[PDB]
């Protein structure tokens, strides 16, 4: 039973996913709008005095297959080393965008070591922001042109993660069975295609 639900950020009452609203996403398959993961959502918002989210409640998103707008992850549980709760996300549409043109934005997650967007096949519009993820690997080889269905140029803001040479040296590279399109993480179930 496909179930569409409203998201956060722009055009929405909710500015971030938080404990107050996380359970509204139970069994959603399609997000009408955006998902935002702000620091206040994950650790607690003093001005509304909203509690810190329960990290195991992020498993609600395993039902998400489509995000109409953008994905904006700026805080993540320190012991969750990838975004495997979005293993079933296939399409980011970017009908609505975040900041200066982004549909995907992964920022300053000191503890994420791979992305894990295993099902991700299409980002229909927008620019890609992946920066300051000091531990992030496996994204270096990834063929964004496949996912963006267009020229990669003027669409990437991918900086300041773990240095490629450092990833290569520690064996944090794509499995040999994966295409030259790359991986979302270690091993053969993580190949882009």
């Amino acid at each position, epitope marked *: 039973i496909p179930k569409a639900c409203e998201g956060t950020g*722009s055009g929405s009452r909710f500015q971030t996913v938080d404990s107050s609203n996380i359970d509204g996403f139970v069994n959603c398959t399609k997000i009408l709008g955006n998902l935002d993961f702000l620091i206040t959502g994950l650790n607690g918002d003093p001005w509304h005095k909203i509690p810190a989210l329960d990290p195991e409640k992020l498993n609600v998103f395993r039902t998400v297959r489509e995000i109409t707008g953008y994905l904006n992850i700026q805080s993540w549980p320190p012991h969750m080393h990838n975004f495997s709760v979005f293993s079933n996300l296939t399409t980011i549409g970017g009908r609505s*965008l975040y*900041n*200066r*043109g982004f549909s995907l934005l992964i920022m300053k997650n000191l503890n994420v070591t791979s992305l894990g967007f295993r099902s991700l096949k299409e980002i229909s519009a927008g620019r890609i922001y992946i920066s300051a993820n000091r531990q992030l690997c496996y994204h270096h080889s990834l063929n964004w042109t496949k996912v963006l269905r267009g020229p990669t140029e003027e669409r990437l803001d991918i900086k300041h993660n773990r240095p490629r040479r450092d990833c290569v040296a520690e064996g944090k590279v794509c499995d040999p069975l994966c295409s030259s399109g790359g991986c979302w993480g270690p091993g053969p179930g993580q190949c882009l295609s």
Partner: antibody
Amino acid sequence: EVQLLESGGGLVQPGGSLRLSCAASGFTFSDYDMSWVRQAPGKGLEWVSTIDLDSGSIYYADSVQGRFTISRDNSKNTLYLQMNSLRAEDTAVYYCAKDLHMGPEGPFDYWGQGTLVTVSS
Amino acid sequence: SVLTQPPSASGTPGQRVTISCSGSSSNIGSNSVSWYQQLPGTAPKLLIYSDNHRPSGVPDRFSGSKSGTSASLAISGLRSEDEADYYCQGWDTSLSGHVFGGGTKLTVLG
């Protein structure tokens, strides 16, 4: 409390050059994308340029492209606009603007009082 | 910088005024709208960002909404002190730059 002070405006001859300065205080300068927005006397707002927190992405308006250079010095809490090949229609108050990098609240969550640039023979 | 706004809007104290802002898919159809208040002689201040959210310190009589490529700013409970120029703004994917509206002069009567 936050504060943006612009400076360096004045009268200058067409084809001439000036350098505007924005001195920042009351926030971590390094966390903020800085921008320049201008306003001709009695006319609307016109975005000029944006640089990001680390000088990693830089954006310009078609109207100034190839004549103005934005820059920043995080260690000095100072934004810069090097303006070359000035045209009379660049006459404007130049505002300095700030917004947290990839924050939700923006763009231009705070503006200074502006410096006035007059371009005339 | 071609976002279409009404040049002028008016109201009496305690009214609700709306200011519209028309754009394109590449600007406010995709990216978010922000709105600014500029009182005469003074620097603009952000009013509304990401289509409908208000900075803390911005009263909730100001509200923003968007659908397609048209955005609306609302000022309920109009005040003398709200007499000002209002600018909408949007990032434009096509331009890699910000695009402002012309401005609307809001006058408070009564």
